[PDB]
Scaffold this active site. Structure first.
Site, PDB file in Angstrom:
ATOM      1  CB  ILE A  10     -39.446  10.415 -46.635  1.00 24.22           C
ATOM      2  CG1 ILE A  10     -38.765  10.281 -45.398  1.00 24.22           C
ATOM      3  CG2 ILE A  10     -39.627  11.900 -46.912  1.00 24.22           C
ATOM      4  CD1 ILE A  10     -37.493  10.777 -45.107  1.00 24.22           C
ATOM      5  N   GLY A  11     -41.290   7.531 -46.023  1.00 22.32           N
ATOM      6  CA  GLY A  11     -41.162   6.003 -46.130  1.00 22.32           C
ATOM      7  C   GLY A  11     -41.789   4.991 -44.966  1.00 22.32           C
ATOM      8  CD  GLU A  12     -46.162   2.443 -45.474  1.00 20.26           C
ATOM      9  OE1 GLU A  12     -46.058   1.589 -46.474  1.00 20.26           O
ATOM     10  OE2 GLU A  12     -47.517   3.021 -45.299  1.00 20.26           O
ATOM     11  CB  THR A  14     -38.263  -3.337 -42.152  1.00 19.15           C
ATOM     12  OG1 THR A  14     -37.569  -3.678 -41.173  1.00 19.15           O
ATOM     13  CG2 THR A  14     -37.556  -3.213 -43.577  1.00 19.15           C
ATOM     14  N   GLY A  16     -40.621   0.676 -38.688  1.00 20.32           N
ATOM     15  CA  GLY A  16     -41.790   1.678 -38.497  1.00 20.32           C
ATOM     16  C   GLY A  16     -41.851   2.663 -39.800  1.00 20.32           C
ATOM     17  CB  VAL A  18     -38.870   6.899 -42.284  1.00 21.39           C
ATOM     18  CG1 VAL A  18     -37.523   7.892 -42.329  1.00 21.39           C
ATOM     19  CG2 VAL A  18     -38.417   5.528 -41.914  1.00 21.39           C
ATOM     20  CG  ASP A 120     -33.082  -5.787 -45.843  1.00 20.01           C
ATOM     21  OD1 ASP A 120     -32.944  -6.842 -46.874  1.00 20.01           O
ATOM     22  OD2 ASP A 120     -34.355  -5.182 -45.521  1.00 20.01           O
ATOM     23  N   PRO A 123     -31.558  -1.302 -53.042  1.00 16.62           N
ATOM     24  CG  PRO A 123     -31.562  -1.376 -55.408  1.00 16.62           C
ATOM     25  CD  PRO A 123     -31.767  -2.011 -54.140  1.00 16.62           C
ATOM     26  CG  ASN A 125     -32.298  -0.134 -46.971  1.00 18.88           C
ATOM     27  OD1 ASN A 125     -33.233   0.581 -46.860  1.00 18.88           O
ATOM     28  ND2 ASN A 125     -32.283  -1.638 -46.491  1.00 18.88           N
TER      29      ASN A 125
HETATM   30  C1  LIG Z   1     -33.826  10.229 -46.296  1.00 15.63           C
HETATM   31  O1  LIG Z   1     -32.769   9.915 -45.561  1.00 15.63           O
HETATM   32  C2  LIG Z   1     -32.979   8.838 -44.934  1.00 15.63           C
HETATM   33  C3  LIG Z   1     -32.155   8.443 -43.920  1.00 15.63           C
HETATM   34  C4  LIG Z   1     -32.141   7.416 -42.960  1.00 15.63           C
HETATM   35  C5  LIG Z   1     -33.431   6.474 -43.175  1.00 15.63           C
HETATM   36  S1  LIG Z   1     -33.471   5.005 -42.456  1.00 15.63           S
HETATM   37  C6  LIG Z   1     -34.946   4.695 -43.467  1.00 15.63           C
HETATM   38  C7  LIG Z   1     -34.992   5.837 -44.408  1.00 15.63           C
HETATM   39  C8  LIG Z   1     -34.076   6.690 -44.282  1.00 15.63           C
HETATM   40  C9  LIG Z   1     -34.069   7.864 -45.263  1.00 15.63           C
HETATM   41  N1  LIG Z   1     -35.946   5.689 -45.498  1.00 15.63           N
HETATM   42  C10 LIG Z   1     -37.302   4.893 -45.405  1.00 15.63           C
HETATM   43  C11 LIG Z   1     -36.666   3.197 -45.306  1.00 15.63           C
HETATM   44  C12 LIG Z   1     -35.581   2.757 -46.324  1.00 15.63           C
HETATM   45  N2  LIG Z   1     -35.395   1.112 -46.079  1.00 15.63           N
HETATM   46  N3  LIG Z   1     -36.589   2.957 -43.913  1.00 15.63           N
HETATM   47  C13 LIG Z   1     -35.737   3.561 -43.046  1.00 15.63           C
HETATM   48  O2  LIG Z   1     -35.497   2.757 -42.121  1.00 15.63           O
END
Ligand SMILES: COc1ccc2sc3c(c2c1)NC[C@@H](CN)NC3=O
EC number: 2.7.11.22
Length: 284
Positions: A10-12, A14, A16, A18, A120, A123, A125
């Site tokens: 669901i994401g990269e 900063t 690592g 996610v 940091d 949006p 975040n």
């Molecule tokens: C989905 O619920 C969550 C809960 C915690 C966290 S932490 C985190 C997330 C994310 C998403 N998403 C990816 C990015 C956003 N900056 N980096 C991160 O560390």
């Protein structure tokens, strides 16, 4: 880690990558962040586990194994960026903007009262749910650890000018920028380099000087050769927004970090006199 089943990336972040994952014991669905360990890290992180608030994404667990740190967070289905992109054609209704601003100020007031800064805000975040809640994510991870480019759009001018020992005011600045973006449907200061970011700020708010920001000219990266731009009207900057809103925004965007409104003071601003908690239209 064997106790977790990855569902999807669901994401990269900063730090690592996610994943949405499921806890094999609790049955829980969570956001798992794989950090690719210093004792200094472990202890600052263990401090964040105790920083619990309704507007702060809960850190459920911190698993340290095999030269890897995993952070296990509460999962929410959507971030403000996506919600803003999705609301682009008609805009987020003002009452929901006010609600989100109000809640984030609560979250910050809490963090700041415990001497913890976000550093940091942006949006991506800020996570939202169907109940009309909005929460601060990745809170405190910046002081913890230190290919995608880091966005500068929400960086306070004191950080850009090389101040090493900045304050909770940096989070207020970032939230001011996000507030403006919700209202206008356009980023406020979308710079693509540190100097472009700074000069975009200067062009709107005026090049700062000793009058409005005592000590500015002695900051590490201040240059007397900075072009001098005049300040513009907030009426021109976030037009639709009413005077209460523009007044609050102006105090969140004060140059001098010591003049900038605190989160606690901002919660008392007249802008929030008629605040309510609407539910958003969210497609998941
Ligand atoms: C989905 O619920 C969550 C809960 C915690 C966290 S932490 C985190 C997330 C994310 C998403 N998403 C990816 C990015 C956003 N900056 N980096 C991160 O560390």
């Amino acid at each position: 880690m064997e106790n977790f089943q990855k569902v999807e990336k669901i994401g990269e972040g900063t730090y690592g990558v996610v994943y949405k994952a499921r806890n094999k014991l609790t049955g829980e669905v969570v956001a798992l962040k794989k950090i690719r360990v210093p004792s200094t890290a472990i202890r600052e992180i263990s401090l964040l586990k105790e920083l619990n608030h309704p507007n702060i994404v809960k850190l459920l667990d911190v698993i340290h194994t095999e030269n890897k740190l995993y952070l296990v967070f509460e999962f929410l289905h959507q971030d403000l960026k996506k919600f803003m992109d999705a609301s682009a054609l008609t805009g987020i209704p003002l009452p929901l903007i006010k609600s989100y601003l109000f809640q984030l100020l609560q979250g910050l007031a809490f963090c700041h009262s415990h001497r913890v800064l976000h550093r940091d805000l942006k949006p991506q975040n800020l996570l939202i749910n169907t109940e009309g809640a909005i929460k601060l994510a990745d809170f405190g991870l910046a002081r913890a650890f230190g290919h995608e480019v880091v966005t500068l759009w929400y960086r306070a001018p004191e950080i850009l000018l090389g101040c090493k020992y900045y304050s909770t005011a940096v989070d207020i600045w970032s939230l001011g920028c996000i507030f403006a973006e919700m209202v206008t449907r356009r980023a406020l200061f979308p710079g693509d380099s540190e100097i472009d970011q700074l000069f975009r700020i200067f062009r709107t708010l005026g090049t700062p000087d000793e009058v409005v920001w005592p000590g500015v000219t002695s900051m590490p990266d201040y240059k007397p050769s900075f072009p001098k731009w005049a300040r513009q009207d907030f009426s021109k900057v976030v037009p639709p927004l009413d005077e209460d809103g523009r007044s609050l925004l102006s105090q969140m965007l004060h140059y001098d970090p010591n003049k900038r409104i605190s989160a606690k003071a901002a919660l008392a601003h007249p802008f929030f006199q008629d605040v309510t908690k609407p539910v958003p239209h969210l497609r998941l």
